[PDB]
Amino acid sequence: NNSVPGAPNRVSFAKLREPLEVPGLLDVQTDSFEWLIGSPRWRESAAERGDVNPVGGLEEVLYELSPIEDFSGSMSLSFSDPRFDDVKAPVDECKDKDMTYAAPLFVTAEFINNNTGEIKSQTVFMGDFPMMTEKGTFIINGTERVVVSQLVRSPGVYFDETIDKSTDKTLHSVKVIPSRGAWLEFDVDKRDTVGVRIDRKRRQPVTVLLKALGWTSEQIVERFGFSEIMRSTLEKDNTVGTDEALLDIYRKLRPGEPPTKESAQTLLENLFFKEKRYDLARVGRYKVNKKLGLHVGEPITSSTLTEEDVVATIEYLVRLHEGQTTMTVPGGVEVPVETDDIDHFGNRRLRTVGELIQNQIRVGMSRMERVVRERMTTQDVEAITPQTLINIRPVVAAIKEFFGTSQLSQFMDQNNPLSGLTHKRRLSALGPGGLSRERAGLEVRDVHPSHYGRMCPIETPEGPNIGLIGSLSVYARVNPFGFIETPYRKVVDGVVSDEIVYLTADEEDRHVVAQANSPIDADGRFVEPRVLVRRKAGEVEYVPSSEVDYMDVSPRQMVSVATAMIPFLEHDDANRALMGANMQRQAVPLVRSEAPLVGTGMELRAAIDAGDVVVAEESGVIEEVSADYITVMHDNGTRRTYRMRKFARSNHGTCANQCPIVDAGDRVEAGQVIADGPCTDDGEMALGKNLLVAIMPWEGHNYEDAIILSNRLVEEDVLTSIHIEEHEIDARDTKLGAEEITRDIPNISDEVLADLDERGIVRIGAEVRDGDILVGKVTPKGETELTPEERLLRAIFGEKAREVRDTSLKVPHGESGKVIGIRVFSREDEDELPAGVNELVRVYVAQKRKISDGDKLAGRHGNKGVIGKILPVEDMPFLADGTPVDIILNTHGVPRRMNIGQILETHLGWCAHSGWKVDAAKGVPDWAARLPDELLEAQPNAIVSTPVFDGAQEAELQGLLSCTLPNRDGDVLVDADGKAMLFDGRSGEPFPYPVTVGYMYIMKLHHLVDDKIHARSTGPYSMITQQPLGGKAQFGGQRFGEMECWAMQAYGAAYTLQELLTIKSDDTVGRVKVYEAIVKGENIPEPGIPESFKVLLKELQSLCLNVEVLSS
Amino acid sequence: VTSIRIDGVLHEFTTVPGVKEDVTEIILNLKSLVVSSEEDEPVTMYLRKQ
């Protein structure tokens, strides 16, 4: 059932079949942009989904704006039908040439003059648009960008309920939150004053505004006769009269203004019926209509609040106060009456990139149309043209600044394809337009019974942003409004239905959802009469096998993409599983990757959709292949070529390459991988290698999470990685002159510049050591001069007649390696450069790092560690057949952390590596009844896969471990339990007891040791603070916190603190004298007065406060 | 083997037209080569295939 053509074959412990393949993992990201721009494919998809009105994003935003007009009504403008054009240049050049992948858009604007009756219509240019590539990313200025979705509370009506501590009576509060406008709060209180708070005003009785509209008092009485408390309020109000009511409302809203009937009458419609001032999203209107069951039969077109909505809301509130279960309104079907919850996914919508870009372009359009309307009103009416009206600067500036500074525009982390995919699938909850860290409640960070199937509960950042950053589920798809959905198959009469439907939160709550793992007969008959089920909220209980309505699709319907590829996830702990999931997103691409021996079946699919692996479009036959490019011949006679980037610096400093895995003369079918990117092996993810592990404390070198590695890994490049640095220098013009890169440099020996070429740059392929010169340049000197008279003089004379300083770029502190390539941009060659620059050159330095001491390693079960020591290959313990182990793990950390899953993973890995053959001559053993018939016979170095929540059981492992194929020597190493006899490498005698061994997948984290190690004895000093610089790159000293001062005081150590505060941080003469004394044999002179104290003095003397010293 | 010399190539992080794998892969493959030395001085070999 391998959907892709030529994926590697790896039989799986399959017991249940999923009736649908995993949907396009990046479809969610691309669909928003496709809807926004508007394409035939999106229109066809929308028509298939059944939506009556196919409406794009640009068309909608710039159609709801038009027709603009002047207040006099003698002029108007309209413009619709936005359309796009082709690309400027391919993505490769745009990324390499520093350009921006974009495309122009043209809008056909029609210019109509009312009083005359003329039409002026022609195309208009409206800037460029940052188009989205096929991998769901934005290329801005050559740097990758990815926008993350956001979680917002859908605009609507929420019925809150707070219990009084003294009265102990229910107070039902209803609050409406539209997209923009006034907020209405109707709350029944102990005093019974059912009032309103329009724009955080005083609680004015609802009846006052109800009558302000002219609502007849008799209609109030009859429609509220069933209500008793509200009837009491009606009998309690004093002011009566439409004019009096509206004037009182106006005074409460705007006091101190001429109270007139017309003013209040116009303000009512302006604040509640003027669409521009008061607007709600179509999602909000639809949700409110569904909540009240009013206006359900028609497609929402008007997006303004209506009076019937308000009267229905107050009726609902009073009925809820009465304690009724369900309420009905004329024209509305029966619906339940209950309070709403903020943390329910039936209210929290999802705004994709489409919504954000639409809002930004809406702001830009508003800014443009304001000036356009002002210009048309003020400009001459005769020879005015739309070309002269439309201004393109505001919209382009808005989009540019949104892409640049908006917090929702983050660099796409590209340590490995999995990290990029996770970032593209991320669900942010903070940032602009959202709650802050301090104001956000702690409860929102907890799980909700409605999260099942929509947001993974495991994957989450470890830092303080816990619970605010989730991830889509495997099968989750966003509905066209923004409410996440989840597939389900509906049971009609106790028989499973192959056909599936998608349900949202509200509909899911209103139905009965079965359990996927519940046994089901092949004919669709429920073998068990009682099947567990999930209910409204936090309720699970067995029910007859008939009333059940819905059933899930797969057991893996609630896990994230990252968490979906952690074997034996049903045995670890929540914290450990989360830690492992977070660790999986920090691997480092190695040089020679190997696919895992044990891993879920969602590896190849997660790699094909990652975009970092090329794939043929049409089934053709390869003519020839090369390390740099490939040429495939289509069956239609069209030759096509694919170019593969080799050794290009990744967005996070790692390397990226592609190696074709195809041979010359093979008819490659469409959809078959052709090249493997970083962290890949035959078109499937591979973030690490396979090492033979042993679990036993060894001389305390593996004490407290430490790790020991055999030198075989070091000397075989098993865990060798490649890291590429990047440096750049620029020569920008100055008032004193222009700097130029030149090979020559004042007062430098020939040896120092022996590497620079004629043009003034280091030759490619030349080794560079720390402190070496990387590119030379000369900085002119400052000499006062005449602007125009000496400018004439210097043009004709005085050439190179003043001085030049040296400011050449040098390798920072702690870098080395080869020089792989040099990129130079020149303004002469007509290359776009930032303003005020002439020559910007960047140099790439690539260094090969071998795993060493102080390096982090961690498996897929979240068990970090450090390389305590790398013993020689001749010292590690070895099996009875002479096979030395490669790594030793401690045992005390397994049961306390409670991550027993890794033990099972190691056992299964050993079983798969050694190969097994289960006896079947006498028949299938009872423990092997459910094993797939093709999984009973394996080969050495076989591949196995255990899907999450459905894998080999304990009995399966027990049986398999008892039938492993013997070694070529004829003997079996491990026992049935899985332990084995070792031999000490030092003593040479066997250990008294057996130990566990096996192959476990090991990754490599990004927290290397070379970055951390740093020293500083004497170096550059800051000029403004007189303190040493900071940071490893700047070669600066370490910080000295105040807690250290407290500790030093605690010991009573005085002279040490004096030195630390005076003689090594501030005192200039002190530093010079102590350095000279150390250079010689003289004793260190006592420190002096720190610069801080003298600065404090000379500063406090500036406030007329005579600060004496009183040395006496 | 101690050190190699590839004509027309200046360093190891690159490729060479006509081959299917880059310089790093061929270095890794050559690491498996096994040779026995009778002389106690650096000797030189050649590998010409077109």
Add this chain to the structure above:
Amino acid sequence: RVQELFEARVPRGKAPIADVTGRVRLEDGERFYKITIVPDDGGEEVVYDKISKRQRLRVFKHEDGSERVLSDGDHVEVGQQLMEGSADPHEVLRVQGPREVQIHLVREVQEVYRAQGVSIHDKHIEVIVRQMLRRVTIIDSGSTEFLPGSLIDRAEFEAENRRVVAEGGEPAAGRPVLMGITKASLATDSWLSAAS
């Protein structure tokens, strides 16, 4: 809890206290407990109008058992809490002096720390409480320059009082009082640290 204890604010529990030793004459109000104690030597009854939502604590008897209920008509020792909670340090200080409040604070902090299982020596807490309660509020200045109601350390107040008395000037009437860490640290002798 430790923060509140050291800060010496109004206890949240605010348990009733035995201001005087006498024969407890308590009438149990189901809404608000009313507590009165007849003095043994003589005098009036101190009246407490406490909230009745709690469950009365042990009465001080020869057995001295926690299971016992607060029995009316018994006798209690001065300063004892009548019900569970925490006694305001100011009240116990004014009615007992500094030693009792010092030992009570030390015992309370030690108890809360041992609740978690950690152990620390008492002297580390004595060194702190010694500084915390080293202020003598003054009600009247009389023959003294300092403003009445101004905090003065005990040593300097005593020195000035003895100096003024030795010359015949009337003494200044002042009493000891404690404060929280913030107020105890905000008032110092060196101006530079205060500015810091």
Add this chain to the structure above:
Amino acid sequence: RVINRNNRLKRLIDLGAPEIIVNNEKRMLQESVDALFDNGRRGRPVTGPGNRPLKSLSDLLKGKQGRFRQNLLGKRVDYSGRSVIVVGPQLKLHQCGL
């Protein structure tokens, strides 16, 4: 501002003028010195950019960036170094590996 206003005062008194303008200008000068020794102490603080209050002379002492506090947060020292730590069982108690 202060120097400019003082020079305006000097020039005006040299030129000669009635009492009102002297005083009006003097009141102005008094405000500038008060502002310089402290901005926002009393009245509307002066704001040039983005309606942002300016950092007066007295602001060098109060606040988190006040020079008093910053002398206690610590300084960057020389002869330092940081690195990862790995347990070593081959060392005596009064020993360490560098």
Add this chain to the structure above:
Amino acid sequence: VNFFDELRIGLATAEDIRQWSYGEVKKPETINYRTLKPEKDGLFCEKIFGPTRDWECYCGKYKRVRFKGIICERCGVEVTRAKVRRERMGHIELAAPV
């Protein structure tokens, strides 16, 4: 050298400020916007605080290193390291008490 028995804060006086400073600023002009040099007696003039560079007279008459604490008559400046610029002050003169 480093003996500070006590520290007392006294309230200064006009004569005290006269004593402390070494100049009397007169113009608000900052560093020149063209030649990037202080203006005559401006807010940075070397005649007040000290030389912009170390051991460098304004006019170049005493620009040799062999001049410590020496005043140039041509430009009326002193010759000492740039650090001295950090420890000398200026006092403005007021035409009206404040």
